[PDB]
């Protein structure tokens, strides 16, 4: 069988006829996260779109950085809502948009 792009997505075993699906092995890209040469020389390696201090993200698998629940302003954006910054191990967090403010509104109040 073939698909719209004309790539062979499926084949059939000539012996004991059976339909077999073909999927390419995972290829991706490697990115390096560093806080600067003058600062401590510890990096984190991010593999683009690859499923594996190993932390799984939507962008890819992240090695060398520890996850933290706290939220800060974005720095060195990994992608898909994850920003990783140096604070000694590099930390990956979900970025916070901004401070939360609830303006007091009344029908007879002005400032």
């Amino acid at each position: 069988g073939r698909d719209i792009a004309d790539t062979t997505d499926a084949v059939r075993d000539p012996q004991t006829l059976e339909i077999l699906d073909i999927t390419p092995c995972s290829f991706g890209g490697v990115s390096v996260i560093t806080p600067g040469t003058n600062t401590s020389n510890q990096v984190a390696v991010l593999y683009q779109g690859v499923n594996c201090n190993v932390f799984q993200t939507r962008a890819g698998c992240l090695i060398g950085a520890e996850h933290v629940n706290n939220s800060y302003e974005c720095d060195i954006p990994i992608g898909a809502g994850i920003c990783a910054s140096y604070q000694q191990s590099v930390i990956a967090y979900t970025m916070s948009l901004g401070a939360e403010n609830s303006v007091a509104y009344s029908n007879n109040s002005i400032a």
């Binding site: 792009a5 004309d6 290829f27 890209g29 948009l97 901004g98 939360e100 303006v103």
Partner: protein
Amino acid sequence: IPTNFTISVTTEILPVSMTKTSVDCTMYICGDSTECSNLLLQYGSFCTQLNRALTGIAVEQDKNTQEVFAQVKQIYKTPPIKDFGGFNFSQILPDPSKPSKRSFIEDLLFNKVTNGLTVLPPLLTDEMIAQYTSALLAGTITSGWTFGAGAALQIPFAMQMAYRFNGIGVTQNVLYENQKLIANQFNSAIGKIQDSLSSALGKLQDVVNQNAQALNTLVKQLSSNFGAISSVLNDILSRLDPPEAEVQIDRLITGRLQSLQTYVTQQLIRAAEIRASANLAATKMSECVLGQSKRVDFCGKGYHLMSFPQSAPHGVVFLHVTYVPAQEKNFTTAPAICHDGKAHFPREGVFVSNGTHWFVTQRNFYEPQIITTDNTFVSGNCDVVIGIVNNTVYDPLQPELD
């Protein structure tokens, strides 16, 4: 002179971004073959140039999605109580009882739009964009244009609407005496938009189709032999000895390089166009939303009052509410009126007569008032002006002196 008005709310669709894609040069040009990679080494720096060119667009898209939306410093929140003088913002405000914080209109908009190749994810999640939009709505509804510059100052909504009427040139008492009708018209307009969208986002759909067609053409171009014996490297390698095979291999390399360069160039042109659209959207967000525009037709047909932003896949949707006059009535006018030998001119408005008596009224609305020295300023004798009619001007102080 108009004697009535209608409130109309319209929509504007603007694309701001496109999907980020990157293509590995070596994988596309050459399969997994050591011999093929050796031939490509002569054609130096082409693959690096193409990869850098694609990376530039990839980062520029994330830049584009930032400036249009991220214009607020603090995430504002609407009060739990809903007292906006009869204006109903339920449809556009976020709905808590939903897996995401998207509003009804945003949900409808989302539902309407439907070999070494990698598609990178966008940096901002859709939930973050919805949070930015909700912040903008809350700030505009509560503060006004004050949160645009120098923190947020709470104002009752009716007073803000009165200020906007004062801005467009209509007296503010028109609002206070006609609040219920305006509230009903605004609600009806919002309902009509909700109905209309459910039954098209043509602008946003074209970009997705164009990008998909470009990628499909790239994938199809592999099957062409480009004048060689065959379209697959493996068959060419086995069929012929290396010295004769190398010519077919270099033919294939040249063809695939040409196709890749064509793809990169057209992607660059399309990225430039999307950048222009994103800049226009950012300017509209700055001016129409965080303020009131005096520019004509920039923020919708008619006199502008305010705008409300919404989020759509790879784009932004603006709702412009405007003021439209209606119910025309004919009259007779004069440039000036001179009493006791001195000409009088209107401070603001027109001189108008129904046929027997003379009044002074504002231009955009019919609010006749008696002529008084508080409404006029003298300039000189009757001679200079042409078309100056004869009429009397009442003196307010004289009867009180009696």
